[PDB]
Amino acid sequence: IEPFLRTTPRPLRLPDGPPCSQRSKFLLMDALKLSIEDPSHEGEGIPLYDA
Amino acid sequence: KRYGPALSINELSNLAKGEKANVLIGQGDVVLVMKRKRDSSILTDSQTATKRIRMAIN
Amino acid sequence: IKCMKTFFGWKEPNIIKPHEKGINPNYLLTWKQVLAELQDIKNEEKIPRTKNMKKTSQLKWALGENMAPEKVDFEDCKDVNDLKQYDSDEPEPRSLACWIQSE
Amino acid sequence: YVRTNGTSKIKMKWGMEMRRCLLQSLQQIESMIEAESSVKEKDLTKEFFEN
Amino acid sequence: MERIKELRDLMSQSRTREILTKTTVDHMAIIKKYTSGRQEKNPALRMKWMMAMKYPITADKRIMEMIPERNEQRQTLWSKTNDAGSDRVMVSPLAVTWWNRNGPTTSTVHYPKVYKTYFEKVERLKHGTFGPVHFRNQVKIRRRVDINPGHADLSAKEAQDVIMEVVFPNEVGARILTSESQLTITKEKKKELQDCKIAPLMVAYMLERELVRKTRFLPVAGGTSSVYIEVLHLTQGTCWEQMYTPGGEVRNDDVDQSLIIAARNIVRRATVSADPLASLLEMCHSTQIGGVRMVDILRQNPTEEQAVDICKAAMGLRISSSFSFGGFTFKRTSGSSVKREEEVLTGNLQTLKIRVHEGYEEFTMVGRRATAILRKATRRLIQLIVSGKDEQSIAEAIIVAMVFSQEDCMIKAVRGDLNFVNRANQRLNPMHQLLRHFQKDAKVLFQNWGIEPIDNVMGMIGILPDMTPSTEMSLRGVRVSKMGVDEYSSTERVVVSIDRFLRVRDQRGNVLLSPEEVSETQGTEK
Amino acid sequence: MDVNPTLLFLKVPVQNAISTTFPYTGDPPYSHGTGTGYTMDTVNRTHKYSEKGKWTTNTETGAPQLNPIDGPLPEDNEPSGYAQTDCVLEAMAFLEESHPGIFENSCLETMEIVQQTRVDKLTQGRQTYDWTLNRNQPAATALANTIEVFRSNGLTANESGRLIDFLKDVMDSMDKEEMEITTHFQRRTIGKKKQRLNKRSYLIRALTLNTMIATPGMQIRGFVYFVEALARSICEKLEQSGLPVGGNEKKAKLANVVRKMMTNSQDTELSFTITGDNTKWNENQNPRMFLAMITYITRNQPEWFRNVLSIAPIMFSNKMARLGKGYMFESKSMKLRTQVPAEMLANIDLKYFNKSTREKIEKIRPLLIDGTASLSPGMMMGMFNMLSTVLGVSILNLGQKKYTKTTYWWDGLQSSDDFALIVNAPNHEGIQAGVDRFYRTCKLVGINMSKKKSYINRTGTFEFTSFFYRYGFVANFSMELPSFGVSGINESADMSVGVTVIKNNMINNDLGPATAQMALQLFIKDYRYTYRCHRGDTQIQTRRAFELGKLWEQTRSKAGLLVSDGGPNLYNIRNLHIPEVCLKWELMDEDYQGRLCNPMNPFVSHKEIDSVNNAVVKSMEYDAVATTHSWIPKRNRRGILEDEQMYQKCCNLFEKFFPSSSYRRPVGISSMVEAMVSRARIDARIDFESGRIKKEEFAEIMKICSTIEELRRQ
Amino acid sequence: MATKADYTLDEESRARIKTRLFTIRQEMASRGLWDSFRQSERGEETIEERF
Amino acid sequence: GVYINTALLNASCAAMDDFQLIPMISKCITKEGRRKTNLYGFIIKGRSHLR
Amino acid sequence: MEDFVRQCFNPMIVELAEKAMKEYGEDPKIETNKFASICTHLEVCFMYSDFH
Ligand SMILES: [Mg+2]
C-alpha cells in the first residue's frame, strides 16, 4: 500500500503537436440561418418550398 | 375399424350409455373409447392394496 | 360480544350499493378487521374494559386520517393553481322525496 | 462552408436520438433537488427554480 | 381442399415425406425451433427505415375483395405483390386507416369479457382516491410481491387445461377425457364466450394471463397487496410518497389460514399417536379443504411453517433449511457449528437438558416487524444487530436472538421458575420456556447482561438496557441500525431426515424442526 | 468565465454526481476494437504469461501445447498463470468445510438439469461458428446443419430429442475416421458437392474458435452449458458471489457485506476496503485448474456425470483459435487493393507487414496449425465466468479468522471481472500483512489483481460492477438510461413497450416524476413521427395525413381515437400501466369501436405463444389489445439443407389441422401425417353431414386421403 | 397381450389400466422424460444412464 | 440535427439511386410567438444503396 | 423425473419401491429410471388386483 496524501497526485499530461481541428458534422457556433418569420405561402410545409 | 368411422369429440355426446366408438383425442390420436358403467373413479384404486401391503411390510 | 354471538348467518361481505364518491373496498376491509378483532378478543382470557383497534391502512382510510389535508402557512402555498377559499357555496337544490314522510 | 462527409445508418439513428440528451440533464438535477428534500422533508422546486 | 392438397404436395417430395413419417407429434415443437431465417438486430432502426417505404405492412389475400385498390384521392392502398415466404399481399398504412374509417362494423360484446384484466385495471384506477404527498427519507424493504390481481392462483398446468377445454373443445388431451372434476370456472367461461369471433390464440393467451399467478422481487415501502403493486410507480419515490387507494374489488383468500390450522391439528394429534408418520399420511390423503383435497394445496401453496414443513418432510419433499423461531424466519449464512448436549442449572435452581451449538456461526432473522443479524461464537454472543419500526419489535427480536444464543451469562440471569406448559399440557422444551420467561420480564437480565462503550459512527446507534437510543454506550454486541436491513435474498432447500417423533434432522445429524416449536394458537376455519 | 463542470465535484461528492462521468446514453455508433491483429496479440500474451511451463506435443492435432500448472513460484509482480493444483484443492477443501453440502446439492441439481434438458436449447444461443460451412451462422441454422451432416454421416442419436443424446452423437462423430459434407448449388442450374474431412481436419474444426469475442462450434456448446449449470447452482448458494443476481439484489448484497464487516469491527479494530479489478481474467485461467476444481467438486458421484462435467475443460485445454478474415494490402502506385486470407499467413513473406505485425507473426508462426493457432493456456470470455467466480469466492472464504491464525481477516464479494475486499486488523501493520497474504494466496491460486485499477480506502466507500457505495448510499449505473425510442414491433406493441419501460424505470431505476413525464412526451412525439399518425387536426402533410383527416372529420368523440389513428395522448404517471385501447375504451365511438376491433380484419397476425405479447431485447412482456393496429412488418432478406424452410413448412399445416399446436407443445405417439389424415377425414365427414359440402368434394377428399395413406405406407 | 387372449379382467378394468398407463405416458412426455424412460428399457431390465 | 438526419434517412430510403437536394431547415417560436422557419444550408446525398 | 415419480404416484407405493430397491443396495437419487420402472410395476400390480 503506497500512501496517498495531498502531494502524490499530478496533472495529466496532454499530447503535444499542432492545435486540434473541428470535426463536427455541422457548424455549431458559426452558422447563419435565412429566416422567414411566418411561412404562410402556398404549398407550405414541403422542405423545398420553405427553402 | 369395426366400431365405425372415427368421431369428433364434440359429437361424442350422442353416444348411448355404454356404447363404444372411435374418437380423435389429443393432437390427432384416434382411440377407442366407451362410456362408464360403474360409478367409480381412479382415486380409490390401489387404496385397498396400499393398506394390505402396508400391513405386510410392517 | 354476547349480542353478536346470538347470530350465525354471517356471510362473506360484499358491496351491493357502493359509495359513489368515496372508498368502497376499505369499508369492507375494516368490517372484516372488526370481526377478526372480536374473534381475537373472544380468544383472550383477561379481557380489559375496552379494546383499542390497532392502526391499519384500511382503518385510517375509512376514518379519513390519510385523506386529511396537512397544515402549512399561506406563504408556502400561495402559488397553487387551484388554491381557493373553502367551498362556501350554497348547496344544490334537492326535490322533496317521500321517504322522509315515511320516516 | 462546403465539406464532404459520410454517414452510416447507425449514425443517422444516433443523430435522431439526440433529443434523449434532454432527459440526461434533468436526471442529474432532479436527484440533487430530491436529495435536499430528503434532508429537509419538504419540496424544494420553488426554492431552487425561483430563489 | 387447400389443406389436404398442400399436405399431398409436401408428401410428394422425399424429404418432406421422410420428416412427416419419422418425427412423432411429441417432438413436433422440437422441429418448430429449427428456423433458418435471421433475427433482425436493432429492430428500432429497421422499423424507422421500413416506415419510409410505400408498402411496409403485410396483409392477406382476402383484402383484395373488401378494400378497393385506390381511395378517393387515388392513393394506392394495397399492391398486387406477395411477401417473401408466403402469399401475404403488400399494403400501406393507408389501408389500415381506410379500414378503420370505412370498414365493416360489428359488435365488440366479448372484448370486455376476454380482456377483463385490463378493464379491471381501468376500473380500479377510475374509482381510486388520492391524498397529500409527504417528503421524507424513504426505506423500501425488498421482498416478493404479487403482480396481477383477479387471478385464481391456479398452477400453470391447470390453467392450460382450462384454456384447452374452453377454446379448444375437440382437441383436448387424454387427461381431460379421463378426468372428473369439471371446474366451475371452465363452464362459466364456456358460457361467457359462446359466440366469440376473436382469434382463438388471443383468447387462450388472455385466459392464461387472467387465471395465472405471478410474483416479483421489488423494493416496497408501503402496502404490499396485489392492487397496491400495480401502482407502485405512482405511490413510492426516493424522497416522496403518495397516498392512494384502488377502488375496485379485493380478492384476499383465507385458504392459507385453514391450511395452517389443519396442519397444526394434524401434528398436535399425531405427536401423541402411536405411528405419527403413516397416520398423518392417511389423514392428509383423505382430507378436503373447501371442496379440494389437501394434497393439491400442499403441493401448490408456498406456505412456510413448522407444521407444514414437518408434513412435507414426512411425505417427502424439499423444505427450507431454516426454522421460524419466535415469530422470526431464521437463516444461516456463514460459519459452521456442532450440536452438543448438556445440562444447565438456571438462576432458579432449575436443571434443564439442552443442546447448544458450538461454533462461529452467523444468522439472519426476518420477522413481521424487524430484521436482524447475529454472529455467535461457541456459547458466546459476539455481535447482534437489529432494525425495527417500533421499540417493542426491537425488544422482542433481541430477546429471541439472545435466547437463541443460549449463552451461559443469561443462565445465571434467570429469575422465577420455568415450568411453562402448552395448552395441550405437554412439557415445553427448555429454550421455548426460557423465551416465554424472558418475554414476560427481562429487566433483571438487562441489568446483569453486559455494558460497554461503542464508537460513534453514522448509520448506527446504540441501545441502553431500558431500550432507548444511545450513541456513547450500549450492550455487549447489541446495536440498532437507523436504516432498514434488506431481508434474506435466497433460501437453500436440502434433503432432510424425519424421525417417527416428527423431528426433522439434517444430514449432519442435527435436528431442524420439532412439533414442540409449533404454535398452539387456535383459529377459525373460514 | 470558462465552464468547467468537473469543479462541481468540489461540492457534490463524486458518487452523488456520478451520472456526469458517463458520456453515452445508448450504444456509441462506431463499435470498433476488434480484428485479427487483436487475436494475435491475445494468443501471444497468453502464451507469454505461461511461457515458463512445460511444452508438449498433442498426439491428435499435432499442435504444441503449454502447461504452466505446478510451475515454478512467481518471483515478480507480472501476471503469472503458474497456478498450483495442491493449493486450489486445499482452497476448495476449506470452502466445502465452511459450506458443507453445497457441492453435493449443486451436483444433484446439475444431474437433474442434465437428465431433463433437450437438444433444441442450443437454438437459444448467439452467433455460432458452423464448422460444416466453416463460417459463422445463426444458432438455429447451425444446429439444423449439424443435424443434417450427422444424419448424412449415420449419426442419429439426437433424433431421440435429448441434449445428452446430441452430446453422445458428437462423441461418435469425433472418433469417426472421416466426415462427409454435402452441399447444394442454388443457381442457371442446381448441382451437388461432396467434401471429405479426415480425422485430424474435423478434430481441428471441432476445437476452433471463430474470432469476429470468439464463438465455439456446436461441438463445445453442451459441455460448457452443463458446467455453467453446475457453476450457477454452486453460486446460487454462496453469499459472497455476485452472480446470477439482478439489480435489486446486488444492492442488498453490498449493504449486507459492508454492515457485517463494519459493525462487527470493535472500537480497537481498523477496517479497510480494496476496490479492485483483475489484471487479465481470461488470459490466466488455465483449464487444468478448472478441471482440478471440478474433480474435487464431483467427488463421490456417478461416473457418467463426472465425465460429462469433465469433458468441457478437457475440450477447452486443447482448443484452437481462428485468425478471422485476414489482412488488407494496399498499393499507392497503382491504387490497388487486395485481401490476403489468414490461412496463407503461415507461408507468406514478412515484408508486407509493419514491425509490430512482423513481431506478432514471428511469435505466432510456431503455434499455427492449419490456419488456426493452438492456445492451450488461458481462456476466452463469456464461458467460464461462474466457475471463476466460484474460485474467487473460495479464496475470499479462505480469509476467515480461523484459517489466517492471526489477528487480520478479510471478506468481500467477487463477480469474476471485479471485486471488493474488506480487511480488518488491529494496526496498519495488520492491514498490510492481511493484504499481503491475500495477494500472495491469490497469486498461488493463479489470480492476478490489477494493481493499477485497485485502490484501498477506509471502510465506507467503494465500487463494485458499476455500483457505487458511499456511506450506505448505492448508485446504480450498470446499464444507464435505456432506449426510449419506439422498439419497432408494431404500433400497439411499441406503445405498450414504451409506456411499460418508463413505468419500470420509475419503479426500479430510481427515475423521477418529471423525468418520466418528459420521457413520455418524447416517446409520444417519436411515435407520432415514426408511424405517420399525426393528429387529425394538425397539418403535417405526410402520406397518411389525408386518411386520418377524413377519419377525424367523420367521427364525433375525437378524444377516443387512438394515438395511431389521430387522437390525443392521455397517459401520465397515473395510468402508465393501462393499455391504450382500454384506457380510452369508454370514449370510443360506436362505429370506430366496431371497425378498429373487427376480428375479421386482414391485418391481424398472431404467432406462437412464446412470441405473443412479448419482445426480445433479455426479454420483456407487454400488454395490449389485439386490434387492427397489430400488423406485422415485412421481412427482409453453401447451404447443407436443400430447402432451408423444410422444418418451418412442416410445422405449418400442423397448426391448420390442430390449432392447439400453436398454444401448447403438442404430445402424441402417432406420426404427424396420420394425424392430419384422420383430422381431415373427420372434418370432411362432418362437413358433408352439415350440408355445406356436396358429394364431389367428399369423394375428392377421400381419394386424396387414401392416396396419402398409400404414399406414406410405401 | 396375454396367452390365448384370455384376459382375466373385464373390459372395464382393462380399460382402467390402459388409461392409467396412457395418462402416465402423456404426462412423462409433456415433462420431457418419456424418451429417456423408453430408452432405458433394454429387453427385460432397466439400466443406468452411461456416458 | 434531428431534422437533418430525419430528412437524410427518409430521402435515402425513398430515393435509392438519385442525387437528392436536402435543405437544412428548422422551425422555431419567436418571442412574439410566431412560427419562424430557418435555413442553415443545403445537403446533397450520394448513392444510398445501403444494406 | 424423480420428483415427478414422487408427485404422480401414491406415496405408499413410492415407499414400497424404495424398500424394494434398497434391498439391492441402490440409491434412487443416483438411479431413477429403475425407480420409475419399479413404481410403475407396483402401481400396475395393485391396479390389477383391485376391486376384485
Ligand atoms: Mg472492482
From TrEMBL, chain B:
It comes from the Viruses. A motif (Nuclear localization signal) lies at residues 35-38. Residues 1-56 form the Influenza RNA polymerase PB2 C-terminal domain. Coiled coil: none annotated. It is found in: Host mitochondrion; Virion; Host nucleus. Belongs to the influenza viruses PB2 family. Influenza RNA polymerase is composed of three subunits: PB1, PB2 and PA. Interacts (via N-terminus) with PB1 (via C-terminus). Interacts with nucleoprotein NP (via N-terminus). Plays an essential role in transcription initiation and cap-stealing mechanism, in which cellular capped pre-mRNAs are used to generate primers for viral transcription. Recognizes and binds the 7-methylguanosine-containing cap of the target pre-RNA which is subsequently cleaved after 10-13 nucleotides by the viral protein PA. Plays a role in the initiation of the viral genome replication and modulates the activity of the ribonucleoprotein (RNP) complex. This is Polymerase basic protein 2. It comes from Influenza A virus (A/Zhejiang/DTID-ZJU01/2013(H7N9)).
Automatic annotation (TrEMBL), chain F:
Residues 258-455 form the RdRp catalytic domain. It holds the Pfam family Flu_PB1. Gene3D superfamilies: 6.10.140.720. Mg(2+) 2 binds at residues 277, 418, 463. Phosphorylated by host PRKCA. A motif (Nuclear localization signal) lies at residues 188-201. GO terms for molecular function: nucleotide binding; RNA binding; RNA-directed RNA polymerase activity. Mg(2+) 1 binds at residue 276. Residues 221-228 are annotated as: Promoter-binding site. It comes from the Viruses. Keywords: Eukaryotic host gene expression shutoff by virus, Eukaryotic host transcription shutoff by virus, Host cytoplasm, Host gene expression shutoff by virus, Host nucleus, Host-virus interaction, Inhibition of host RNA polymerase II by virus, Metal-binding, Nucleotide-binding, Nucleotidyltransferase, Phosphoprotein, RNA-directed RNA polymerase, Transferase, Viral RNA replication, Viral transcription. Mg(2+) 3 binds at residues 418, 463. Residues 55-64 have a biased composition (Polar residues). Coiled coil: none annotated. Its EC number is 2.7.7.48. This is RNA-directed RNA polymerase catalytic subunit. It comes from Influenza A virus. The gene is PB1.
From TrEMBL, chain G:
It comes from the Viruses. It is found in: Host cytoplasm; Host nucleus. Phosphorylated on serines and threonines by host kinases, including human casein kinase II. Belongs to the influenza viruses PA family. Influenza RNA polymerase is composed of three subunits: PB1, PB2 and PA. Interacts (via C-terminus) with PB1 (via N-terminus). Plays an essential role in viral RNA transcription and replication by forming the heterotrimeric polymerase complex together with PB1 and PB2 subunits. The complex transcribes viral mRNAs by using a unique mechanism called cap-snatching. It consists in the hijacking and cleavage of host capped pre-mRNAs. These short capped RNAs are then used as primers for viral mRNAs. The PB2 subunit is responsible for the binding of the 5' cap of cellular pre-mRNAs which are subsequently cleaved after 10-13 nucleotides by the PA subunit that carries the endonuclease activity. This is Polymerase acidic protein. It comes from Influenza A virus. The lineage of its organism: Viruses, Riboviria, Orthornavirae, Negarnaviricota, Polyploviricotina. The chain holds residues 155 to 205 of 716 of the full protein.
From TrEMBL, chain I:
Phosphorylated on serines and threonines by host kinases, including human casein kinase II. Signal peptide: none annotated. It is found in: Host cytoplasm; Host nucleus. Mg(2+) 1 binds at residue 41. Mn(2+) 1 binds at residue 41. Belongs to the influenza viruses PA family. Influenza RNA polymerase is composed of three subunits: PB1, PB2 and PA. Interacts (via C-terminus) with PB1 (via N-terminus). Plays an essential role in viral RNA transcription and replication by forming the heterotrimeric polymerase complex together with PB1 and PB2 subunits. The complex transcribes viral mRNAs by using a unique mechanism called cap-snatching. It consists in the hijacking and cleavage of host capped pre-mRNAs. These short capped RNAs are then used as primers for viral mRNAs. The PB2 subunit is responsible for the binding of the 5' cap of cellular pre-mRNAs which are subsequently cleaved after 10-13 nucleotides by the PA subunit that carries the endonuclease activity. This is Polymerase acidic protein. It comes from Influenza A virus (A/Zhejiang/DTID-ZJU01/2013(H7N9)). The chain holds residues 1 to 52 of 716 of the full protein.
